[PDB]
Every structure is written in C-alpha cells, then in structure tokens.
Symmetry: C2
C-alpha cells in the first residue's frame, strides 16, 4: 500500500505537472467590469490592491482594447471603466470557466459531511503554509 | 466565511503559483544508481519504463558526466552504470530534498487519525482525477 506522505507527494506532483502545461489582477478587473462599471477607487477597494497596481492593470487592459474609459455623466472629474464589445465574450468565457471549476470543487466537497470537510479544510490550510 | 470550494480553488492556485516559480526519469536513475550499480534492464524494471526511455535518459546523464558505464566483471556483454564522483553530491542533495519533503508530508499526516487520513486520501484521489 501507499503511505499518505507518498499520496500527498504524488498529488502535488500532478498539480505541478498540470501547471507546467492576462495577469490575475487584469483578469479580476475584467470579471469585475463584466458586472458593473467602476472607478479606479472602487476597483482598488473591491480587489484589495494598491491604486498603482490598479492603474498598471487598467493600462494593460486598455492597450489591448479590452476596456474603455468614459466620464461619469454626473461628475466630469470621475473616470469610469467598462468592457469593450471585444471583451464581452472574453469575460463571459473566463467567468464560465471559473464557475465551472468551482462547481466541480463544490460537487466533490458535497460528497463529504461537514465534519469530513473540516478535516479536509484543516489539512489544506496546513499544507498551504508549506508553500507560502 | 469561505466555502470549501473556494478553499480548494485558493489552495490549488498556491500550488500552481509555486510551480510557476534533469527530467524526472533522469533524476530517478540518479537516485537509483546512488544506491546500486545496475543495467538497462534492471533500471527499466525498477522504474517501470520502456527500454527506449531508459537508453534516452542514460544518454543524457552520460553526456553530463553524471554516470559512467563499465563492464560486468563476470560477463563482458553486460553494461553496468554507476555515478561519477561529480554526481555523488548531486544525488545526495536530491535524495535529501526528497526525504525532507516526504518527512514534512508525513509529519502533517501524523496530526490526523487513520480515519481522518482516509478522508484526506479519498479527497485527494478524487481531486487528482480532475487533473489527469
């Protein structure tokens, strides 16, 4: 039989191999803008990142014509950002992938009782640490 | 609070990030040869790989002067392979890393009862599948 240590080793090897086959900030803005027009400030708050990081990601998305700025109809000083037509199916495709992935994790989790899920949760947190 | 699905998603993201920061056959031969001189046949059996794959990996290791061929003192037709002096500390360093990694997984596993470990084992097998 196989030790749990070896099972864990093999499992992590499989996830790392799969890895070896848009930044995440950019893709998170895409997803956010897919749901509501927003400002730099709003984006920084919702994403929990610095204003410099938001400006940097917004610039990359703009260069790619994934998003576009406009002026708040109420206030001429506030710049709003929204998806371009070109970005609509990009964001939709990313949102769908994310949702499907999470659904898969959720269905797997649902095969376990709350008590079992707590075991799994503690296991994953402790193992996460070894990789942070 | 955070759903298990989201915990799993974040956990896999961390392992994949860590990944984004010698082939495994070659390194397995190094480790094997670190413990005993062997032939192509022996290597293929122990590693569960094709003779072509072994020849391919042996050639790469030889080019790198990590291993060297010699003739079986008993039989002139059989080629044995062993580490070179240069490879000794390479294999030692790899063996030590592997052992340390497994020790870490083992110590983490030891914080869980056999029953909890079974929960974790089933969880990991089912999740592995999603990535094979």
């Amino acid at each position: 039989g196989m030790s749990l240590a070896n099972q864990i080793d093999q499992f992590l090897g499989t996830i790392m191999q799969f890895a070896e086959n848009l930044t995440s900030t950019q893709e998170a803005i895409l997803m956010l803008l897919a749901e509501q027009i927003s400002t730099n400030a709003k984006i920084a708050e919702k994403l929990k990142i610095s204003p410099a990081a938001v400006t940097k990601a917004l610039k990359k998305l703009q260069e790619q014509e994934l998003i576009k700025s406009s002026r708040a109809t109420n206030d001429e000083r506030v710049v709003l950002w929204s998806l371009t037509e070109k970005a609509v199916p990009v964001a939709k495709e990313h949102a769908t992938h994310h949702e499907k992935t999470l659904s898969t994790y959720q269905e797997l989790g649902n095969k376990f009782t709350d008590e079992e899920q707590e075991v799994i949760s503690k296991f994953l947190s402790a193992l996460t640490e070894e990789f942070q």
